[PDB]
Design an enzyme around this catalytic site. Structure first.
Site, PDB file in Angstrom:
ATOM      1  N   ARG A  75       0.854  -1.183   0.000  1.00  0.00           N
ATOM      2  CA  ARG A  75       0.000   0.000   0.000  1.00  0.00           C
ATOM      3  C   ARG A  75       0.888   1.231   0.000  1.00  0.00           C
ATOM      4  O   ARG A  75       1.656   1.451   0.942  1.00  0.00           O
ATOM      5  CB  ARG A  75      -0.925   0.007   1.241  1.00  0.00           C
ATOM      6  CG  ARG A  75      -1.880   1.188   1.297  1.00  0.00           C
ATOM      7  CD  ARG A  75      -2.890   1.150   2.447  1.00  0.00           C
ATOM      8  NE  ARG A  75      -3.537   2.467   2.494  1.00  0.00           N
ATOM      9  CZ  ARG A  75      -3.539   3.288   3.540  1.00  0.00           C
ATOM     10  NH1 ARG A  75      -3.022   2.904   4.710  1.00  0.00           N
ATOM     11  NH2 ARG A  75      -4.095   4.508   3.420  1.00  0.00           N
ATOM     12  N   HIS A 119      -3.218  10.786   0.544  1.00  0.00           N
ATOM     13  CA  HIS A 119      -2.725  10.620   1.911  1.00  0.00           C
ATOM     14  C   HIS A 119      -2.115  11.962   2.368  1.00  0.00           C
ATOM     15  O   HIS A 119      -0.946  12.020   2.782  1.00  0.00           O
ATOM     16  CB  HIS A 119      -1.702   9.470   1.952  1.00  0.00           C
ATOM     17  CG  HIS A 119      -1.533   8.827   3.306  1.00  0.00           C
ATOM     18  ND1 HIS A 119      -1.584   7.459   3.482  1.00  0.00           N
ATOM     19  CD2 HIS A 119      -1.237   9.355   4.523  1.00  0.00           C
ATOM     20  CE1 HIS A 119      -1.355   7.170   4.760  1.00  0.00           C
ATOM     21  NE2 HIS A 119      -1.124   8.303   5.413  1.00  0.00           N
ATOM     22  N   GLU A 164      -7.839   8.245   6.092  1.00  0.00           N
ATOM     23  CA  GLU A 164      -8.260   8.863   7.361  1.00  0.00           C
ATOM     24  C   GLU A 164      -8.891  10.253   7.185  1.00  0.00           C
ATOM     25  O   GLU A 164      -8.360  11.244   7.721  1.00  0.00           O
ATOM     26  CB  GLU A 164      -7.109   8.919   8.368  1.00  0.00           C
ATOM     27  CG  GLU A 164      -6.522   7.514   8.675  1.00  0.00           C
ATOM     28  CD  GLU A 164      -5.340   7.523   9.637  1.00  0.00           C
ATOM     29  OE1 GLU A 164      -4.804   8.612   9.970  1.00  0.00           O
ATOM     30  OE2 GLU A 164      -4.957   6.417  10.095  1.00  0.00           O
ATOM     31  N   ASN A 287      -7.970   1.329   9.643  1.00  0.00           N
ATOM     32  CA  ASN A 287      -6.713   1.428  10.362  1.00  0.00           C
ATOM     33  C   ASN A 287      -7.032   1.317  11.833  1.00  0.00           C
ATOM     34  O   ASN A 287      -8.104   1.759  12.268  1.00  0.00           O
ATOM     35  CB  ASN A 287      -6.004   2.776  10.093  1.00  0.00           C
ATOM     36  CG  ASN A 287      -5.624   2.967   8.650  1.00  0.00           C
ATOM     37  OD1 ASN A 287      -5.667   2.038   7.838  1.00  0.00           O
ATOM     38  ND2 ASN A 287      -5.252   4.201   8.307  1.00  0.00           N
ATOM     39  N   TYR A 289      -4.811   1.221  15.893  1.00  0.00           N
ATOM     40  CA  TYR A 289      -3.566   1.281  16.703  1.00  0.00           C
ATOM     41  C   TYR A 289      -3.797   1.143  18.196  1.00  0.00           C
ATOM     42  O   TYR A 289      -2.973   0.555  18.911  1.00  0.00           O
ATOM     43  CB  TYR A 289      -2.808   2.620  16.508  1.00  0.00           C
ATOM     44  CG  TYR A 289      -2.255   2.776  15.121  1.00  0.00           C
ATOM     45  CD1 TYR A 289      -3.020   3.346  14.096  1.00  0.00           C
ATOM     46  CD2 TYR A 289      -0.993   2.300  14.822  1.00  0.00           C
ATOM     47  CE1 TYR A 289      -2.512   3.462  12.807  1.00  0.00           C
ATOM     48  CE2 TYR A 289      -0.489   2.398  13.550  1.00  0.00           C
ATOM     49  CZ  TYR A 289      -1.250   2.989  12.552  1.00  0.00           C
ATOM     50  OH  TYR A 289      -0.690   3.051  11.311  1.00  0.00           O
TER      51      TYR A 289
HETATM   52  O1  AZF Z   1       0.249   7.595  13.201  1.00  0.00           O
HETATM   53  C1  AZF Z   1       0.653   6.397  12.526  1.00  0.00           C
HETATM   54  C2  AZF Z   1      -0.002   6.377  11.151  1.00  0.00           C
HETATM   55  N1  AZF Z   1      -1.453   6.539  11.239  1.00  0.00           N
HETATM   56  N2  AZF Z   1      -2.192   6.471  10.047  1.00  0.00           N
HETATM   57  C3  AZF Z   1      -1.735   7.235   8.876  1.00  0.00           C
HETATM   58  C4  AZF Z   1      -0.202   7.318   8.848  1.00  0.00           C
HETATM   59  O2  AZF Z   1       0.161   8.358   7.940  1.00  0.00           O
HETATM   60  C5  AZF Z   1       0.464   7.510  10.239  1.00  0.00           C
HETATM   61  O3  AZF Z   1       1.897   7.510  10.151  1.00  0.00           O
END
Ligand code: AZF
Ligand code: CA
Length: 438
Positions: A75, A119, A164, A287, A289
């Site tokens: 990706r 992005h 996101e 996503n 975390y």
């Molecule tokens: O914060 C970690 C990751 N979170 N999602 C999008 C990515 O660009 C970030 O690095």
């Protein structure tokens, strides 16, 4: 044994501004991340994406790493201003050439490209015209997406419109912590709405141009638990997670508690746009975390976070592997998308190269193993998870944290640009080779 379905897609993920460097090489336009990071006070240590991982030059080596690890999918994102330096109009062939080479190389090596169209590196020229605040971006984004589909759609068959969009709208335009660095709640909610409209226009154009591919969209997600025996958890899920976006896409309106909080901030006639926003998508990328303890709090959004005594990463993020299972179950339960991917999961730890030349990131192995294990569970209980992507292949520019946070399964020594595969990358390659955990 935890063996995944046949043909399950094990991947790694990156983003253009975080790894590439050379933001202005070969006729590229400035992005909002270029101008935001060159503004003092915005990014830790004054760090910028000027050099990053120098992937702009080292791309062949990096892909050879993906190949050598046996990772099956990559990706990556495309820098809009490399392709259309003013955002719309002129197309830069050298920008297309850069991604053409990456695409052909991946395919030659049997690696599946998943392309993130946006992005976060909006062309600066479009930001001068209001960026995500301007309704016209649905048109600009549709034109950009069309160029990508026309150029790459013969080879790339798996596409993501937005990464996101909650972060883009709220961290970019309310918190001011990300480009373009604004703090205006009315602008932030107009950005939410316009991100949806642009996403749907791009899908509409995709159907006209790439009649063999699949297209989806990626959301950030937290696992919110209530501090006691509630509604604040409901609000956080609906606001911070996939429903802010999926409720429009699948049901044609914003989630109930989002409207309770934010109706005044949305355009007055925003429902006029909803039937178009319902454009059919092929998959949802999630996503994940971290988990968060949440409780009601008068005068906050009416929500504050409660710190818990749990293992945390270098971000201060609580490690809560069950969260990835929950969000996967919850997405099937709420919207039943036909396919789901985990498009990012990973962790930042204070990695050090030992005297032995190695990076013994057992903390990151433990994090990944546990989350892969929970993803496995979701699959056993019927979630149509088709793939899983580690964030990230490489240590890289972590936005407002700069280079101070390392998420790679490959260590990057920024003084020399040396890549050192970490223990977690070796470990992951074995998982991929085995198609699961043992
Ligand atoms: O914060 C970690 C990751 N979170 N999602 C999008 C990515 O660009 C970030 O690095
Ligand atoms: Ca610079």
């Amino acid at each position: 044994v935890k063996k995944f379905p046949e043909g399950f897609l094990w991947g790694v993920a990156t983003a253009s501004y975080q790894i590439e460097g050379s933001p202005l090489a070969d006729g590229a336009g400035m992005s909002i991340w270029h101008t935001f990071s060159h503004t003092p006070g915005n990014v830790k240590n004054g760090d910028t994406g000027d050099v990053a991982c120098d992937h702009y030059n080292r791309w062949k080596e990096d892909i050879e790493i993906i190949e050598k690890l046996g990772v099956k999918a990559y990706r990556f994102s495309i820098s809009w201003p490399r392709i259309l330096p003013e955002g719309t109009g002129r197309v830069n062939q050298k920008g297309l050439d850069f991604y053409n080479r990456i695409i052909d190389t991946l395919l030659e090596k049997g690696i599946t490209p998943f392309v993130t169209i946006y992005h976060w590196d909006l062309p600066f020229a479009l930001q001068l015209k209001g960026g995500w605040a301007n309704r016209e971006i649905a048109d600009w984004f549709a034109e950009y997406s069309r160029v990508l589909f026309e150029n790459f759609g013969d080879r790339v068959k798996n596409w993501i419109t937005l990464n996101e969009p909650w972060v883009v709208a709220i961290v970019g335009h309310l918190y001011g912590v990300h480009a373009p660095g604004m703090r205006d709640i009315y602008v932030a909610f107009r950005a939410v709405h316009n991100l949806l409209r642009a996403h749907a226009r791009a899908v509409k154009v995709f159907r006209e141009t790439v009649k063999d591919g699949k297209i989806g969209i990626v959301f950030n997600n937290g696992y919110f638990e209530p501090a006691s025996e509630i509604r604040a958890v409901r609000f956080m899920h609906q606001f911070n997670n996939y429903p802010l976006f999926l409720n429009p896409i699948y049901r044609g309106d914003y989630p109930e508690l989002v409207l309770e909080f934010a109706r005044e901030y949305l355009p007055e006639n925003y429902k006029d746009d909803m039937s178009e926003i319902q454009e059919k998508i092929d998959f949802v990328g999630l996503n994940y975390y971290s988990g968060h303890l949440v409780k009601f709090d008068p005068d906050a959004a009416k929500v504050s976070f409660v710190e818990r005594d749990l293992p945390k990463t270098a971000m201060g993020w609580e490690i809560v592997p069950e969260g990835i299972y929950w969000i996967l179950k919850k997405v099937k339960e709420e919207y039943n998308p036909p396919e789901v991917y985990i498009t990012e999961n990973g962790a930042a730890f204070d990695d050090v190269v030992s005297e032995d030349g190695r990076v013994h990131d057992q903390n990151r192995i433990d994090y990944l193993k546990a989350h892969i294990g929970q993803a496995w569970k979701a699959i056993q209980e019927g979630v149509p998870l088709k793939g899983y992507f580690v964030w990230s292949l490489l240590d890289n520019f972590e936005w407002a944290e700069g280079y101070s946070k390392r998420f790679g399964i490959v260590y990057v020594d920024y003084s020399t640009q040396k890549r050192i595969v970490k223990d977690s990358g070796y470990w992951y390659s074995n998982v991929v080779k085995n198609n699961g955990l043992e």
